[PDB]
Design a protein around this nucleic acid. Sequence first.
RNA 1: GGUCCGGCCGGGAACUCAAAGGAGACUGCCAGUGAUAAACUGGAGGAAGGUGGGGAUGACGUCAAGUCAUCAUGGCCCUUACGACCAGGGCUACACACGUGCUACAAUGGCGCAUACAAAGAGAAGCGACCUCGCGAGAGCAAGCGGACCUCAUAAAGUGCGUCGUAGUCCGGAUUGGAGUCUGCAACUCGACUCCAUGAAGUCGGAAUCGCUAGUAAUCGUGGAUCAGAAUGCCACGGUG
RNA 2: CGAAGAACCUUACCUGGUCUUGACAUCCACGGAAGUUUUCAGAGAUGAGAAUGUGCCUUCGGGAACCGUGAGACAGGUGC
Lengths: 114, 127, 96, 150, 98, 79
Amino acid sequence: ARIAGINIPDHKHAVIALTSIYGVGKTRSKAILAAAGIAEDVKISELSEGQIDTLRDEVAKFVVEGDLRREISMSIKRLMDLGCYRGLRHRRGLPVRGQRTKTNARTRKGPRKP
Amino acid sequence: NQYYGTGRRKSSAARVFIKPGNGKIVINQRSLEQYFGRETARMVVRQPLELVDMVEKLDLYITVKGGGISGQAGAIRHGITRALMEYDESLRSELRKAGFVTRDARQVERKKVGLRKARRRPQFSKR
Amino acid sequence: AKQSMKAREVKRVALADKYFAKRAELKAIISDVNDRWNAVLKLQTLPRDSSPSRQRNRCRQTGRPHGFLRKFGLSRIKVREAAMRGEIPGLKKASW
Amino acid sequence: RRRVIGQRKILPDPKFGSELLAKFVNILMVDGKKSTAESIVYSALETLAQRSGKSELEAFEVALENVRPTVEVKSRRVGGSTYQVPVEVRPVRRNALAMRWIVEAARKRGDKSMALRLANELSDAAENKGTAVKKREDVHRMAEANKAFA
Amino acid sequence: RIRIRLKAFDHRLIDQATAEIVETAKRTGAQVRGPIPLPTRKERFTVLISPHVNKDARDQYEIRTHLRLVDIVEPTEKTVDALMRLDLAAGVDVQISL
Amino acid sequence: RSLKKGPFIDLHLLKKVEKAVESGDKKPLRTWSRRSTIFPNMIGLTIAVHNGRQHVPVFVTDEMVGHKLGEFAPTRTYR
RNA sequence: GGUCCGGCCGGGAACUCAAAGGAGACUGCCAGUGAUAAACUGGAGGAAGGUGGGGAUGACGUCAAGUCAUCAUGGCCCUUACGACCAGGGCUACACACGUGCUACAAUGGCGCAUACAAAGAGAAGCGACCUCGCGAGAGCAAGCGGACCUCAUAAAGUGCGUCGUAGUCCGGAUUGGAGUCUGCAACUCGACUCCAUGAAGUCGGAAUCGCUAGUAAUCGUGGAUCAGAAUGCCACGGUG
RNA sequence: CGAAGAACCUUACCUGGUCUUGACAUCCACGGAAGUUUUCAGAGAUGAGAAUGUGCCUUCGGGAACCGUGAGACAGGUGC
């Protein structure tokens, strides 16, 4: 499928190899391994592009890491600001989830200090 | 012709029937070995009937209503004892002397409030 | 808050099937997120203080709302007496 | 405390009819789960006999001779400071307390498997080399010595 | 298997009751059950009638509270009519809802 | 985020935009129910908030779409 | 006795289950003990043994301790008042503790597919399967169930075959990229939880607050109500041990 | 902690809106059928409009079910 991105797996067997790719969803990997589909032991080089080229037209609209690590940060822009939903909390550069999580931003936005 | 019992131990809920000749141990439709296949107690159920030459004389049929294998090993003790208890009155002395009549009933006067041990009253050599 | 609000529960407590819970039985089923009709819901949420379910309740044998035990039917202070005429059949010497 | 009730009765091992091989495992258990701990102790005794090709379970003794003590030290401040006097352990105690030092040597031992942490330290224990035997010999260096200070 | 759940304040008054249903109803059909119990609530009951606030006088009574099961195989009116004609026993309950 | 399957409002607020959106060069609007979510028809004006120690002005420039009105109100001195 | 392999429905009362009324173990006769007292061991005989156990009644006396936040009420209470109606808000900051309560440091371990057995409890301001929709929290239809009938657990270990090689990782959910909803005027500078992407401390730390003696803390899990409802509290019995 | 739900929440308190028989409840006096429904304001308490409605006895007396406005007596709270 001519997989774009940054890294490659390093002589590890398929079922680690596939899952050590720097942004192809692990929990799903259990099943796509049979969709292309290939043996568990193969060290990924012997796939000769052609072996997963068998599913290529899917992959060209999937988030494989290149997207996930830069291009996905554009996605929020019509949802980004003060008003209703999802909101200005992201464009501010803050920790987005946890208990009083604005107060965790010490490191993220400058202060470091208590 | 036949003789019988039932048990209650950690946590089961088992019955047992003595039957005429051929000497086998049949739990519903399978053998002893299929039901305790690793379960290190397994000998204790056939032990007191192998004394009295079971092989041409008795036959043993079982069924179970909440398994419980670690506790079943004594529910069956008490049960198979109630069955032999009308086969031959002679062996009540063998079953007792071998512990095969005993059944769980005791705590050793244990804690209620704080103290460990709780029946025994203040003791002295002349207070 | 002692007696407070009773009058304003009373004034709409019996007709919630007429503010929604029968009024709904044709127009509001097409208005589900299961059935899609998006212009319809925005005219039935208007009833505000009488939208079912919402109920201030009434503690009755107690004169003021010091809770309400919805398993037993009495205030969070009353309990002692149940043990003394028959109301809580399970209340022996506590397990603690 | 006037009444005789002071020790557990337990039942014998499933194979050789011995409360010896039974108290071993029931010292080794530390977390509960018995019957698979009993099958892994049965795996210790086969890995044992790989050395020699016979009833090495007879040499179980010829290791246990070196792990059994005669003495133990308990609370005796009597004489205005620590005045020990161990007293000997009654005959029934000599080999259960030896199982106590076989299991503390096995815990961090380092051998491949836990079947082998026990079956190797028994092998050493017959060699007097052992870490269970070293703990006993410590007490003999200690309180059996301090016979002469009592 | 229509479960008529028979129930009386006392063992006295359900015994008097049930022994006629297992006779009367059974005469031509359905093998009619009547003795087989439910969790009979032999409890301890305490009411405050103390003529001032002082220690105790909460007279602890016992109770019987005893329920059984009348059971019939089919709605055979030429055997069963007789228990339904027993409507005149206004001092025992039956809960036939099934 | 618990605005759980789509938009809502302050109901009394947008009812009351209606002359201060009539040629937006005007002086501010004000709100006390700070929960306060708001329509993109507000674009071009000033809308201040009860923080609530004092009343601090938030600004409807060129982008408004994405979060409740609390995101700029300093409620007590954050150590 | 028939099987169309479901106690399916025929068919009879061993016995569990269910349980109403209840009912039986006493030094009871045997070995030794001593004063043929005293009672202590082992036992015949057992479902317990010398309160058999587990619940339980907790008298005067209870520390001048509480329940002075329903007490039941004497002495005395605020009354422009401590009397009663209503929408807002912010309690949680942090440099410091300090401990309760958590875990997370890899094999007496887990990781992956496969195999063997229980239940304490809850239920019409209910509980709700199969069965339709699934990345799933979460949508929906709809048989049912009033107390062995409906559903929540398909307790964890354990067993059998595969899989790492002692490895900051495959485990660490401390946490922060983006992605979702059941409720609501309402949770956001306030959550509670679902999908991926993650990766803070990590590596066995001493000084010394008392946990816990037996079926008793490790170990192996479940419920319940307050209540428009998220305690990590406690509370109670089970068992590999 | 008492809170087994300190953002409608059984309100401590920060604020404003309001009252001091309040919110609940009697003894006479003069009177009335009780309610369904919708529009617009107001943060809530509360404010300004519009339709449809009229029960049981029944001496047509007296009133009930059940809402008023005027009186004179007159209401309360963990305060320990």
